Amino acid sequence: MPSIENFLAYDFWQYDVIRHLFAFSTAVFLAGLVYFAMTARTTAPNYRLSANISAVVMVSAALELGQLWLLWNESFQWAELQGSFVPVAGERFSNGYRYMNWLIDVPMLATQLVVVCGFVGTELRNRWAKLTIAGVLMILTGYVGQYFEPAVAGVPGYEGAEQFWIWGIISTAFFVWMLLILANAVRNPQGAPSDEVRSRLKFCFWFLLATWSIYPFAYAMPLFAPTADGVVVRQVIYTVADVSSKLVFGVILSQVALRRSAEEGFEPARVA
Amino acid sequence: MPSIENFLAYDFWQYDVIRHLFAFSTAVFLAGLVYFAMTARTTAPNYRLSANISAVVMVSAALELGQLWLLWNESFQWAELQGSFVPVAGERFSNGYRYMNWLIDVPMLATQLVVVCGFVGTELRNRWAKLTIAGVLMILTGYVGQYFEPAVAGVPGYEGAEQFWIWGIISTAFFVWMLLILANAVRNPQGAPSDEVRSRLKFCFWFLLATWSIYPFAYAMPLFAPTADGVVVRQVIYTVADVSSKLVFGVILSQVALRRSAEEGFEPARVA
Amino acid sequence: MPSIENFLAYDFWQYDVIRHLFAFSTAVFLAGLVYFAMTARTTAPNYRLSANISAVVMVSAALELGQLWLLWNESFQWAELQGSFVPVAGERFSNGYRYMNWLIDVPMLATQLVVVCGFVGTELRNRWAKLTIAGVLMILTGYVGQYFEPAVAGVPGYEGAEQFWIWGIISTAFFVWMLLILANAVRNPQGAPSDEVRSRLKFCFWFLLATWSIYPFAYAMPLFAPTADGVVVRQVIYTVADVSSKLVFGVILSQVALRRSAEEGFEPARVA
Amino acid sequence: MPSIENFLAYDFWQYDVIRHLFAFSTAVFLAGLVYFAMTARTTAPNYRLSANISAVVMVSAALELGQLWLLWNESFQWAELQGSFVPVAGERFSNGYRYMNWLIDVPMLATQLVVVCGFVGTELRNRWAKLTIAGVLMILTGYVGQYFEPAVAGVPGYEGAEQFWIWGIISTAFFVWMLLILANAVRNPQGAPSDEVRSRLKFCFWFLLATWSIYPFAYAMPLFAPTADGVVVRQVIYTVADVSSKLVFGVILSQVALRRSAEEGFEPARVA
Amino acid sequence: MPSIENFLAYDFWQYDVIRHLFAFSTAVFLAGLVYFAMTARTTAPNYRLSANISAVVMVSAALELGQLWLLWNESFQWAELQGSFVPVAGERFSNGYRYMNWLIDVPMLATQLVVVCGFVGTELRNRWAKLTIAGVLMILTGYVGQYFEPAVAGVPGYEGAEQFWIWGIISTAFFVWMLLILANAVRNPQGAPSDEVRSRLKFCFWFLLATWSIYPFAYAMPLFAPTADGVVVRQVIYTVADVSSKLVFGVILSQVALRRSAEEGFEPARVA
Numbered sequence A, B, C, D, E: 001m002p003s004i005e006n007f008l009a010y011d012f013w014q015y016d017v018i019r020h021l022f023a024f025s026t027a028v029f030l031a032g033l034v035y036f037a038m039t040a041r042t043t044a045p046n047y048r049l050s051a052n053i054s055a056v057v058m059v060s061a062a063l064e065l066g067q068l069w070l071l072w073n074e075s076f077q078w079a080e081l082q083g084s085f086v087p088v089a090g091e092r093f094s095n096g097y098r099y100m101n102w103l104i105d106v107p108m109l110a111t112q113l114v115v116v117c118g119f120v121g122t123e124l125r126n127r128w129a130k131l132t133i134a135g136v137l138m139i140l141t142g143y144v145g146q147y148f149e150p151a152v153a154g155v156p157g158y159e160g161a162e163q164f165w166i167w168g169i170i171s172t173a174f175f176v177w178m179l180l181i182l183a184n185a186v187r188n189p190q191g192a193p194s195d196e197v198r199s200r201l202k203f204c205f206w207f208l209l210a211t212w213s214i215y216p217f218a219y220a221m222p223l224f225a226p227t228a229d230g231v232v233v234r235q236v237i238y239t240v241a242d243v244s245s246k247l248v249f250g251v252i253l254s255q256v257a258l259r260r261s262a263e264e265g266f267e268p269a270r271v272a
């Protein structure tokens, strides 16, 4: 079923904000790509995978937000007798372009925190494999459930509201498992981290947890607020969540990765 | 409410100038991106964050101006019985694509001046955090106010002119606070700068202040001149302001960052 | 004859999944391009051709999936009285954009496995030449056969179902020959590989074989399931197959190439 | 007023040549960007600014020609009952997209010749500032004058032919001043150039002068030849002029910059 | 006159093959650009110009094939009552987008063979200048002649078939001269090449000659086969010719350039 966005009309500002947010995020991510590409070398090689992952996540995110921007532009047009942007006939907006890209982002983001905790080899591979499984299942179960949002919002003639709940609850179980895997890594860092590194890893985990927590809220929004102001708020919190979870987290984790690099005597890391 | 631009028609030249300006700026910024990417290494590592920020700002700005270019092309079409470019039916131009990207640019630009003053660590982080707060509030308050510009221009049937003023005045308070934070950094540079560096930092601040000051003028233009010639002038001063605030400032600040690099004996900085 | 996709209508979700998959894959490949570009140097020079090939394959794949994404968007439009995406009049979707790009990917992927087995010079060239011949013939014979899929699916008025079979069976003969060439290389690796390298090469071959095997299934799908749910499943298995055969295989083969690099004392490979 | 191009119809070949020229130039400049990016390091650091400028100019030029290509495609369509490309209703072509980008190119091109003459510091800055002033005024005065070209061509109902002349003549005064600034730099090179360097700098100046001289001709063309064959010739000479002034000049000036690099003992410059 | 392509209709497969070929070639060239950019450094500096030229040619070729792809998509649309792709009203396809880009490719390709033969300085410059003159004249004379192809094919109402012949024959004279210049360079290589290098240079020349020879055939095709199957064959042989002449030749010439690099003791060339 089409997203709740398609069943509304928009004031100039409601539509215009959302197109600005989609455009802002594409730029943040492309700018982040340039920054992570330009600064990766400064990390020691045994942490440089984390640096590289951040560039990969930026590409993924930039295309995710760019496609949403395009589809948002395509899917509505102004009507001057209504003074509203209104759905165009041949096109329907999907908030689910974003889910599929999360299949890249989510396991990568969790993986780079584990890389900086200092896991290597089989132990990195094992943790990567659990997080990827846990991640893909969270995301796929959520993607199914968001196909039922016109139903949960009570748009006449759409049925299957229960499906929204079931798929969300299953999804959230997979979320908890990922948080348990990562909580176990940051509590058990490898390579004799300092107590400062020890602390910065814990902060990275709670930052991860706080920012990832917004996404389940944005999921449930059609239930609370299925209106054009709700759509505006939902796209605002997705934007806060994307920039934090991906770019701000990447900069924070880069700072820990540099401290570890320098503590093990990487000279590029020390000169800065 | 749609921007004042949408309530006018344009002579060939009025429209054509504006599309040229949008296109010119996109090119300046992409060219600036190449230049900052090609010259960053020449800066010492303890100032290279400034170099990197300039590349980030260039990406941000290039996409900001590119989207405006696209929307400007989309939003109007020629009419030969009027010999004017006139608003197309399904699309409305927004001068507010630019505001959202300022959320990247403004705190970054101020941050790179602080990096070159020589702040590091917690002291950099603290200043970055104040400038980001001050910056986002200036920009968000201004963004609200520019949604009221058809009202302030007296386009029949648009109300809320007072909202233009209130949101502008609040915005300007946040501007003053940012200028106070930066004034305190350039007056208190770190790392035993030379008296030449000391002077060049002060010039960077006043350049920043002069160029940033144009933006509040472009804001108030619908009040002074809500006409197609006014729209032309407004887009000319935004263009002067963007190129100065972002690219020319970046080159100037790079020159200070190099002088500091060389004074601390960075050899790449000395060989040039 | 146009692909079976053109003879169906789609529910919102059927269409929307497929456009998400095409978009997801383009992003995976562009992100993979960044990753392979950023990590190639870490491989020793005598294996760096493999690293370079992975970047080449990523470009090829990203454009292949991007074209499909574009054509998928162009080829159908929503109809609200049918609540379906339906074929647009002037455009027809082709699943065969993907075949032509395989002419790059398939011989390159097989070549980089041979490079890492340690063949060099004439022996690399000979094997490259056999695999390229075998590969192009497999792909060209398959491309002919997929022009007959409306016929094999029993779309009224389309004839030549037998042509689907003949061209598929011929294609599969060329597949077997490529698998025989590669099986001979991984069983006869060069340069005194360790027993761990020896094992990792064999795993690379079976991974290659498993993932390449999905493609002949996706070929035969119009025969089993010529429905919109079948089209959905087919595009899901192509997506699993593309990401595995190209990106995941590239990361796995990079790990072997690094182990070999380090065993021969490449210092960048050892520091990580 | 719209450019003279808009008042004509085109044979297949007239239109097709022009779209080919616009496309050819975009490619030359993008290819030039790759070349200047790949070869900049070979120059000594004290001349590397020249190398960098060439990359900047290439980006600028590629976007200038790309936008003209796009607008040329947008602005006309084929009509089979006339067998002509003819102006589309909603769009008008502007030859003035190119002027605005010259604001980047012209002062940069002149600046890089001064860099290679060996000016540095204040003396470079002073000369850059004079050339930028002289350049912007030449270009802005010319841009005004080209808004009067339908008038000078005698398209019925367009007045202000005199404005074409006045703005052209003013523009040309600013041209002469730039040529005087540059003539003074190449006659007074810095850093004890060889007599070969001394000669190569003079050739660079006369090459600059010859190629820049074509642009004032292309300006005056509506006066001589306001026909579709004239439009073809004008776009041919702009293309010769762009490739020469920007790319060929950049390669020539790079050869001088390398000779100077090698004479001062830059080893990368000597090994090649 | 419009190309012969415009006077035909296409079966699904005829059209679909051609759009696949245009798309395949764009990808090969972009992938080739990445490969040549990633491997240039491995060549010794005195041969690195050849490496750089290959990247330049790849950019040129990628845009040439991309524009043809776009125009091919734009110029025809499906008609279900004819089951054919048929010319759209407002657009006409030109096979001559490709000619203009040859102005870059042809003299560059010939130049890089001369660079690897070991010519330098004035002797390189002289040969570059002859090949560029010879090349531009071959290409411009051919470009004129291909404007007469509807005439030579006997499309009713198109006259000037003789012009096809005259311009082709003139063009071919310029071809012979280029082949004579290059034949003289590969027979007289510089820098005491080995007998293996001596042989590999001769093979490069005959490869060049064979692949360049296809282009005059594709020219003459409207004479032999002015049908949709002919158009298919012509675009197949252009595709074989482009990939061979540009990418495969570049890889072959890179192998010679590396052998020469290593023989003169370039260590990066020896380690691989």
Ligand SMILES: CCCCCCCCCCCCO[C@@H]1O[C@H](CO)[C@@H](O[C@H]2O[C@H](CO)[C@@H](O)[C@H](O)[C@H]2O)[C@H](O)[C@H]1O
Binding pocket: B028, B029, B031, B032, B035, B039, B042, B247, B251, B254, B255, B258, B272, D045, D046, D047, D048, D049, D056, D104, D111, D120, D121, D122, D124, D125, D128
């Ligand atoms: C559209 C993007 C535009 C970017 C173009 C920037 C180049 C413009 C330069 C104008 C000349 C101003 O004056 C001159 O500026 C350059 C560049 O900062 C300075 O150049 C300095 O940095 C460059 C680049 O890191 C070094 O190669 C150079 O050796 C060094 O001196 C000169 O010391 C200064 O005297």
Ligand SMILES: CCCCCCCCCCCCO[C@@H]1O[C@H](CO)[C@@H](O[C@H]2O[C@H](CO)[C@@H](O)[C@H](O)[C@H]2O)[C@H](O)[C@H]1O
Binding pocket: A028, A031, A032, A035, A039, A042, A247, A251, A254, A255, A258, A272, B045, B046, B048, B049, B056, B111, B120, B121, B122, B124, B125, B128
């Ligand atoms: C949108 C793209 C992202 C832009 C990134 C902007 C980063 C700057 C904002 C944060 C500033 C406050 O926090 C500051 O962050 C920078 C960058 O992480 C840190 O900087 C650290 O990494 C950079 C980059 O590898 C080094 O050049 C620097 O010497 C080092 O200290 C500072 O030690 C920290 O105090």
Ligand SMILES: CCCCCCCCCCCCO[C@@H]1O[C@H](CO)[C@@H](O[C@H]2O[C@H](CO)[C@@H](O)[C@H](O)[C@H]2O)[C@H](O)[C@H]1O
Binding pocket: C045, C046, C048, C049, C056, C111, C120, C121, C122, C124, C125, C128, E028, E031, E032, E035, E039, E042, E247, E251, E254, E255, E258, E272
């Ligand atoms: C579409 C993009 C082009 C992709 C290019 C892929 C080509 C490789 C497959 C062909 C293999 C044929 O034979 C092989 O070619 C490669 C590439 O020139 C050569 O490779 C040579 O250059 C590469 C790159 O500079 C070096 O890392 C390598 O060590 C060196 O030997 C081999 O010595 C040769 O035996």
Ligand SMILES: CCCCCCCCCCCCO[C@@H]1O[C@H](CO)[C@@H](O[C@H]2O[C@H](CO)[C@@H](O)[C@H](O)[C@H]2O)[C@H](O)[C@H]1O
Binding pocket: A045, A046, A048, A049, A053, A056, A111, A120, A121, A122, A124, A125, A128, C028, C031, C032, C035, C039, C042, C247, C251, C254, C255, C258, C272
């Ligand atoms: C779409 C982008 C695809 C790339 C994304 C990243 C993929 C990696 C995910 C981690 C997989 C777990 O397995 C892990 O893989 C990485 C990358 O191959 C390996 O990493 C190895 O190569 C990288 C890059 O050359 C080195 O910085 C690292 O030190 C080295 O060990 C680990 O040794 C392995 O245990």
Ligand SMILES: CCCCCCCCCCCCO[C@@H]1O[C@H](CO)[C@@H](O[C@H]2O[C@H](CO)[C@@H](O)[C@H](O)[C@H]2O)[C@H](O)[C@H]1O
Binding pocket: D028, D031, D032, D033, D035, D039, D042, D247, D251, D254, D255, D258, D272, E045, E046, E048, E049, E056, E104, E111, E120, E121, E122, E124, E125, E128
């Ligand atoms: C399409 C955009 C890009 C086109 C660039 C192609 C350049 C082609 C050059 C044609 C040959 C002319 O003559 C030749 O030029 C090249 C390039 O400047 C010079 O080459 C010089 O610079 C290059 C690149 O920095 C060095 O690798 C080379 O060793 C050095 O000699 C030759 O010394 C000169 O004799």
